[PDB]
Amino acid sequence: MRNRREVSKLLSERVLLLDGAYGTEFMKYGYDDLPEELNIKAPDVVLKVHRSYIESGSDVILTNTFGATRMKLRKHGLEDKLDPIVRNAVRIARRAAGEKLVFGDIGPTGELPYPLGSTLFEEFYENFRETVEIMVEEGVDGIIFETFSDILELKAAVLAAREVSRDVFLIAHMTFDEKGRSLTGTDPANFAITFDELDIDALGINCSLGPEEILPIFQELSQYTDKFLVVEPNAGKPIVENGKTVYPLKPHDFAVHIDSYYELGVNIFGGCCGTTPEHVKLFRKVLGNRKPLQRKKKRIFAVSSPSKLVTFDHFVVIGERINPAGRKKLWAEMQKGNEEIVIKEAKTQVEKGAEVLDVNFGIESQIDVRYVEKIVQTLPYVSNVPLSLDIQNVDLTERALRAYPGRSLFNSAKVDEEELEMKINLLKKYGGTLIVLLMGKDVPKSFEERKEYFEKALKILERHDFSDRVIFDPGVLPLGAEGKPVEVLKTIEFISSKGFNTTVGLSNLSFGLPDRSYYNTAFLVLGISKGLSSAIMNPLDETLMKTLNATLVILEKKE
Ligand SMILES: CN1c2c(nc(N)[nH]c2=O)NC[C@@H]1CNc1ccc(C(=O)N[C@@H](CCC(=O)O)C(=O)O)cc1
Ligand SMILES: N[C@@H](CCS)C(=O)O
Numbered sequence: 001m002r003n004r005r006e007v008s009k010l011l012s013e014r015v016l017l018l019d020g021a022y023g024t025e026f027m028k029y030g031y032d033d034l035p036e037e038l039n040i041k042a043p044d045v046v047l048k049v050h051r052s053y054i055e056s057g058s059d060v061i062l063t064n065t066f067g068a069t070r071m072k073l074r075k076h077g078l079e080d081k082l083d084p085i086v087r088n089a090v091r092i093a094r095r096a097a098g099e100k101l102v103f104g105d106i107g108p109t110g111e112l113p114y115p116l117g118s119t120l121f122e123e124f125y126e127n128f129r130e131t132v133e134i135m136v137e138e139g140v141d142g143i144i145f146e147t148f149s150d151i152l153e154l155k156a157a158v159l160a161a162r163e164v165s166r167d168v169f170l171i172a173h174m175t176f177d178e179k180g181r182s183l184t185g186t187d188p189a190n191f192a193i194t195f196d197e198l199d200i201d202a203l204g205i206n207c208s209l210g211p212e213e214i215l216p217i218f219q220e221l222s223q224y225t226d227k228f229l230v231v232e233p234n235a236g237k238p239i240v241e242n243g244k245t246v247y248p249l250k251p252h253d254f255a256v257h258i259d260s261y262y263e264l265g266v267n268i269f270g271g272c273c274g275t276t277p278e279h280v281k282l283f284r285k286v287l288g289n290r291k292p293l294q295r296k297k298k299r300i301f302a303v304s305s306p307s308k309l310v311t312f313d314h315f316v317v318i319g320e321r322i323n324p325a326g327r328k329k330l331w332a333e334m335q336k337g338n339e340e341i342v343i344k345e346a347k348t349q350v351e352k353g354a355e356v357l358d359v360n361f362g363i364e365s366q367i368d369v370r371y372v373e374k375i376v377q378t379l380p381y382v383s384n385v386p387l388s389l390d391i392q393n394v395d396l397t398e399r400a401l402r403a404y405p406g407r408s409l410f411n412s413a414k415v416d417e418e419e420l421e422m423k424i425n426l427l428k429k430y431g432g433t434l435i436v437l438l439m440g441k442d443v444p445k446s447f448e449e450r451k452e453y454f455e456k457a458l459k460i461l462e463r464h465d466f467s468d469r470v471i472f473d474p475g476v477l478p479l480g481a482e483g484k485p486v487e488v489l490k491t492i493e494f495i496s497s498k499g500f501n502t503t504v505g506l507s508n509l510s511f512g513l514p515d516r517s518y519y520n521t522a523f524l525v526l527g528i529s530k531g532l533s534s535a536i537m538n539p540l541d542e543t544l545m546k547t548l549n550a551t552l553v554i555l556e557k558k559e
Contacts, residue, residue, distance in 0.1 A: 002101065002141045004169035004201050011202075011228050011267045015290045016101075018232060018270020019053035019061045020280045022046075024247065034076055036068050039088040046089070050096035052277040057284025060268065061097055062105035063089040063135070066146065071109040071119075071127045086131060090138035103142040103171070104135035106157065113152045113405065115378050116184070121403035122373070124156035132164045142169035144230070147207045147272075149175060149183035151194060151306050152377065152405035159402065159430070162199050170200045171230055175207040180217045184381070185307030188217050192224035194304055194407045196297070197431045204230030207272040210237050210249055211257040219264050226297045228267040233257075235274030247274020251282040258286050265295045299468065301501055303356060303433055304406035305380035305387070310355050312471070312501045315552060316534035317545075318388050318409075319354030320507060321345050324362035331362055337371045339378065346383035352539040357383060358411060360390035369399060376400045388435070388536065394422055401430035408432040411536075412473065415440050415453045417460060424464045433469045435503060436461075438491070443477060447490040450474055454495060471501040471534070476523075480512040485523055489530050496531025506537040521547045528555070 002010075010016070023035050029045050031038060038046050046064045053061050068086050073079045093102045109127065111119045132143060143161050148154040151174070158172050174182045174191045181187055186194075188205075195203055203225050205218055211233040218231055236249030254271065261269060269287060271279055302311040310316060322345050324331035333341045346357055357379060361367045372391075379387060389404065390411035391397045401408065412435040413423040420436070427434055438444065438453040454472065461467045474491035477483030488504065495502050509523050510516035521544045524535060528551055539545060552558045 001139050002169075003167040004142070007101070007142055007169040008201060008228070011292065013291060015262065015266065015287060015292050016059040016268045017057055017280070017284055017287055018230070018268050019050075019058040020056075020271045020275035020277060021273050022049055022062070022064055023066070024273045025049050025276065034078075035064055035066065036073070036085050036089075037078065039064055039085050039092065040081065043088060043092050046092045047096055050093055053280055054096055054098070054100060056277045056280035058100065058270070058280055060101040060103055060141075060270075061093055062103055062144065062146075063093045063140065065089045065105050065131070065135075066107040069106060069109060069127050069131045071111055071123075072107075075110065082130070083134060086134040087138055090135060090140060094139065101141040103144045104132070104140040106131055106143065106145050107147050108149060108153055112184075113150060113377060113381070114374070115381055120374065121152060121156050121377055124153050125160045128157040129160035129164060132161045136165045136168060140168070142171060142201075144171040144173065146173050146232075147175045148173060151182070151184070151186050151191065152403075154195075155198070155405070158195070158198055158200050166199075169202070171202040171204060171228075172200050173204045173206050173230065176205060176214075176217050177208060178213060180220070187309065188220035189224050190304050190309040190406070192221050193300065193302055193309065194431060196225040196227060197407075197428075199429070200227065202228035202230055202267065204232070204268070206230075206232035207234055210234055211254055211261075213237070215257070215260060218261065218266075222264045222295060223298050224300070226295065229265055230268040230270075231261055231266055232270040232272040232275075234272050235276070235279060238274070249274065251279045254279050255282045255286045258283060262290060262293065265293050267292050301433065301468070301471075302407070303386040303409045305385050306405050307384050308386060310386050312533055314557060315528060315532075315548070316356060317354050317539055317548070318356045318358050318503065318534055318536045319346075319349035319539045320358050320505070320536045321349055321538065321540065322357060323360040323390065325360075334361060334371070335366055337368055339375065342375055343379070343382055346379050349539045350383050350385055353545055354385065354539040356386050356388050356409060356534075358388040358390050358536045360411075364391070364393045364396055369396060372396060373399055373403050377403045377405060380405045394426070397423070398426050398430070401426055401432060404430070404432070409471070410434050412437045415457045415460070420457075420460050421464065424461075424466050427469065428466075433471065434466075435473050436470045437473045437475055439475050443475060445484065445487070447487045447494070450487065450491045451494060454491075471503050473503050473505070476504045476506065476508045478511050479509055479519060483509065485509060489526055492527050492532050493530040496533070501533040502531065503534040503536060504532065506535045517541050517543050520544055524548060525551050528552075
């Protein structure tokens with residue numbers, strides 16, 4: 001009925017009240033069946049629960065479709081009822097809602113992404129796409145992905161939804177434990193930074209914890225996004241009384257927290273498991289009519305994996321090793337679709353100090369795109385760290401960005417209008433940061449020429465509103481080919497002075513020469529002294545890594 005611009009307008013004018021729990025309510029009516037089944041078996045019960053919230057003052061109610069996706073329904077022998085379950089649910093909610101908003105509610109599948117589970121990004125995507133299709137056809141005022149525990153699964157859900165409709169208001173939620181971490185390790189800042197740049201309309205948190213515990217987690221989230229915010233705490237932490245589980249937080253003790261969420265910029269407030277019509281009735285009285293607060297957001301340059309957020313506020317070691325060039329064993333295995341060998345190189349580099357891993361597949365026309373898609377999804381989970389996607393083919397780049405679990409660093413766009421625009425557009429759609437290589441047709445041979453490319457890059461970047469998502473690579477050329485490293489050091493110092501992060505493919509300096517390690521170490525020390533913020537380098541080089549540590553200690557960047 002209403003599109004995202006209209007819902008956004010309404011939210012900009014007033015904080016809305018969502019509804020309470022459905023799963024924890026159906027039992028009080030004598031129905032302990034799977035919630036989604038009632039949409040067909042006892043639609044009357046679903047209608048009653050929705051009306052109890054509308055009659056309690058809710059401005060928005062959720063469809064009874066939390067577990068209504070093929071992958072989840074298949075687990076209860078209901079996959080073939082997906083269509084009626086979802087169409088009925090929406091209709092029932094629409095009848096109860098009248099003029100109020102109805103959001104299509106979609107929860108996770110219960111299946112972990114490969115390699116923890118067996119599911120690839122593409123299957124999650126199709127799964128969510130089908131449910132969203134039905135909801136959009138039936139006329140929802142928005143889609144909310146509730147209770148997500150993994151960022152890759154949630155990214156597939158939001159991308160599938162946006163692909164079905166560019167006009168539906170989309171809300172993404174993750175649920176966090178007491179330590180402020182989702183199941184696969186994502187903290188609130190990581191969730192915010194990763195998802196703030198995707199085309200969603202709002203971010204939020206629901207379930208797992210009560211209103212008191214969610215407060216600092218919601219605060220962290222609010223500081224890193226300017227999108228609309230939603231929260232639905234459980235009515236206190238669940239405790240056992242007589243074999244069963246109960247949510248003990250009463251209306252008043254729950255309601256008293258509304259003001260504190262209002263202060264942190266909340267736009268929609270509701271409750272999850274344990275919340276009843278009685279809680280909602282009180283929330284309505286306490287919330288009243290309020291205009292949401294403003295906040296903007298903290299700006300940070302960071303990349304992520306499900307469990308790690310790497311901020312560029314210290315020297316970042318980017319492992320160069322997953323790169324087949326000049327590596328017989330590795331290159332052979334890549335063509336054979338060998339995963340564990342790349343996993344071994346990933347883990348070893350991280351053990352040695354790499355905080356991000358560059359990933360390159362050599363002659364891409366010789367590699368299975370399915371293998372790329374699998375490696376990109378896998379390394380962040382098993383190696384734990386973010387990736388620098390060193391990919392040339394633009395179509396292959398889109399595949400890798402789509403399935404990347406977090407916010408990646410995309411390894412380079414040269415300063416060429418067409419290439420940059422093409423890469424900037426893929427990043428805008430799938431999220432991520434970009435390494436911009438300071439060269440074009442030819443390779444610059446001086447500082448002045450590199451500076452010209454820098455300034456041209458800034459022009460093109462300012463034009464596509466992308467100046468805050470790049471790292472500059474001056475372009476290190478072989479010493480044994482008149483690379484003139486001195487001109488690169490000048491360039492690093494100049495870009496650093498301008499406030500931008502920098503990086504270099506360090507080992508290039510010494511290829512062709514003997515004692516590579518010493519030239520590499522010497523250059524890195526000099527570069528770091530000029531402001532170099534990262535480097536694609538060999539973390540397995542003990543001399544290089546030890547001297548790097550000594551360098552950082554000496555310069556007061558650590559001890
Ligand atoms: C040009 N480099 C580069 C980049 N990315 C950016 N942004 N900038 C760059 O300069 N990606 C690729 C490469 C950095 N990675 C690497 C990885 C391995 C070796 C290397 O020395 N490989 C072989 C030796 C090859 C030879 O002898 O010529 C090895 O296994 O030692 C060099 C650079
Ligand atoms: N909207 C769902 C949330 C389950 S975590 C329900 O209320 O059942």
